[PDB]
RNA sequence: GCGAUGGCCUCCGUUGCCCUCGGCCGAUCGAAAGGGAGUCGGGUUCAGAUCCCCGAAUCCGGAGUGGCGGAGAUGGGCGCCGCGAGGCGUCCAGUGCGGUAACGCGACCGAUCCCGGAGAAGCCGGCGGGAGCCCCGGGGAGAGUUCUCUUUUCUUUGUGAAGGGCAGGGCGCCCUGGAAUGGGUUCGCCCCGAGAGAGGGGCCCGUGCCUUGGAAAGCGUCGCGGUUCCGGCGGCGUCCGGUGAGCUCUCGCUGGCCCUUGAAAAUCCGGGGGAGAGGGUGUAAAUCUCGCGCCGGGCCGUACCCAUAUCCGCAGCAGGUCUCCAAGGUGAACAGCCUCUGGCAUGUUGGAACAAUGUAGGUAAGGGAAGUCGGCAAGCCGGAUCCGUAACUUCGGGAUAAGGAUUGGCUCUAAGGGCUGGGUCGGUCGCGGCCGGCGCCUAGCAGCCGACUUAGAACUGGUGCGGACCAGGGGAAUCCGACUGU
RNA sequence: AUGCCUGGGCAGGGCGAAGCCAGAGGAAACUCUGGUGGAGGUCCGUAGCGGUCCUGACGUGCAAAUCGGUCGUCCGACCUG
């Protein structure tokens, strides 16, 4: 929106962070049950609605 | 009655609101509208401003009066009786 | 033809965000922002119409910035009153006080009288 | 006044590819002065040839691009508007030169 | 920008403690000195030349005179 | 006024107490389009730049010791010395000055208190000023055509904020003077013995022109240094004029409308007063600070899309979503059509034929609503100029009623305007200036410029001419609802 | 859906009301003619707003109400953030 507040930047900060996929290495684990992020969101679908 | 014959400031409205109701108006539109002599200067620069305030463009005084007219008579009226009871009273 | 567009974020045409056209040493007509026209102070009579003479006409915060001399006249009343409301003012006290004084001494000779 | 402009090709007719003689004929000719092509309109403008250098000098008022106007005539008519361009080299002045 | 209409004014306000380069344009009957102040970049304008080039010796203190070009 | 510490306990600051003074009007929140001091130009990144770099500014706050100059400022009288300029002693005044006036000059003491102004104002019409853009006549620079012509057509042809000065507007500002034989004046209005015309002045905006900025930079060209990196180096130009109910923005007057009267507060300033301060004759208190000089301005957003793909509709959905900029031609027009700057690949695919049904366009001999519940649909008229226009009526309308003629091209004619110019002869001074009687164009003429129209005439095209586009079908009546509107 | 506050916007044309000017007639009252003026919950009409008719297209659509032509209004009981 260009004109924001800091509590919703920083909200949109640690979205944009949280997205990022799975490193390689996590899968190699001996326990490990997880294939792909699951959780990851787009800007199209998903609105994320705040 | 160069243009209009008997409707004048009213042939604005046109054939609505009836002409009974044209007529009427048309002694209100004339007189509120109409420029008197500001009995201060003597000049023709008495002009409604407002319902009920006329201001002199002169002068710059300005009278409260009647709605459509500077002066009812009502107004004479009662202003000649207060005079009547104060020179009264006063004696 | 160079269009060109606002340099604010404020798209919406209101007192705040008129501007003018400008040509700049790069050839080029750009958006200058300017600031409101300023009004002359009225008289404090409240009967003349129109504004007093001899002061800028600027803004209020820019009346701080503006010399003394800029915002009034050497006068009495300079500045606030127009000189003719100032001497009509002057003649109507003196011939108050003078009408006073003479009630004050024909009561005074009504009272040696009676 | 005296307007004095100059259509100097120094190398066009070293390398043998254009007359100085013939392009000052076709000027002659082509040369309008109020309207009038022919005749020069009178005593008016006045041409001198040097082998490489054509002067004009005229005294009414004078447009300077007329005669780049006229010698790209001249060079499309000779069909020389595939090597040679009109410069100015300087105020008053012309050249012809390769690209 | 302040013009200044007298070469002792012009003086005087380069002689100043916080004045710096001076520099000198040559513009073609048109050379101009410009101080730079504090606030203000004072501009003397002089028709002459050989006033000007009089004037390029008056600095006292070895300021930054260095001519543009 | 008292008490105390602190710092050259000189001088100042601080807090504690006492005396004194004091209206406000409800704490607080409430607008990234209301009010709200102050930044512009050039350059720059793969992606941000009124924010970064360079160059010019400006606003607010601080400034104790006050860092400087300048204003309060260096007057008069008396008695002496000295030819003289001048010097000494003593009495003093000195919170500025000028103009009849509007008012002006860089400052030019001032409190509690009080008054006022700005902030702070609706809609619409007309006119005028300025700017941006468009137009025309030319100079240049680069350029398409040149099988024929075209002094060719196409692009460019500049200066910021902040100061100084001058054009140009407005004044309900002042002075001389008193006018009917009424005058002045606008597109209209309007003004005048409560002071009009005519002269001399004053103030406000001056966003426009010149100047500092500023040509150093930018742009258009011609030519080089450099294998390469390279934000380089240089020659020139960036010019002279006229215009228009022309479009947009802004400013200023003037009006019309309201049983509509068209916002508050923060903040700033001016004025009435002298409560109080100053040094005493060379200095000082004050500078609503006059010109400079020093320091600081903290926190948050700053990318992109803003819409036939970045938002909402389950989606890259023919839907919806608030604004600014607005070229040329035709044209009444911001109508439709064509073109320039800019944008794009025809809108979730292509190829081959052109069967029947369709969707969207058209055309049809003769009749012209005979089809159908019903002229449903389509079609007809359509712009402009010139004639003409009934019944009825609330006298305003009906009305573009109805009904007629013209419309192209080319060549001409007539009409509707601005600026300048005669003070010519003699005398005199340096073609220019002054004086005297002359001509006084007082029926105006001479020269120079410029935007469009209106009417008429002839000729002519295969009767075609609002040739595409835009673009009313009318008349006679009945019922209902006054109407506009929802 | 409505009330309030604060902002924005609405080409080009026709009819030509009050008011004013000049001419003519009159003994007066005043009346006719030619202009100026631009008022109107005025008319044609663009943007905007709304949705009459074709009961057109589509009707497992572009769309859980859209598109084309034709439409009413467009200075005020107007539209809108
Ligand atoms: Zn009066
Ligand atoms: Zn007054």
Known sequence: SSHKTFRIKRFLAKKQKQNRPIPQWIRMKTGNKIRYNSKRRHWRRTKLGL | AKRTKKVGI???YGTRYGASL????????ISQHAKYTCSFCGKTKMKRRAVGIWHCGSCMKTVAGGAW???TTSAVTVKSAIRRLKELKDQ | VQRLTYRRRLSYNTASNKTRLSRTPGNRIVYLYTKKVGKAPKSACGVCPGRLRGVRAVRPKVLMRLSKTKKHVSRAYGGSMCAKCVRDRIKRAFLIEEQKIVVKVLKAQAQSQK | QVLKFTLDCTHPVEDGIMDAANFEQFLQERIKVNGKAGNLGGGVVTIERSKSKITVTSEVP?????????????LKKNNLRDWLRVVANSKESYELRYF | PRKIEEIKDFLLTARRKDAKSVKIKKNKDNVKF???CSRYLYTLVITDKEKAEKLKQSLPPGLAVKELK
């Not at chain 2, 044209?22 to 539109?29: A, G, L």
């Not at chain 4, 447009?63 to 001249?74: A, E, G, I, Q, V």
């Open chain 5, 34 to 36: 410009k101080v730079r």
């Open chain 2, 22 to 29: 044209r007529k009427m108006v048309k002694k209100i539109e």
């Open chain 2, 69 to 71: 007219t500077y002066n």
């Open chain 4, 62 to 74: 004078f447009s300077k691009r007329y005669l780049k106007y006229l010698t790209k005539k001249y």
């Open chain 2, 10 to 12: 009213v042939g604005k």
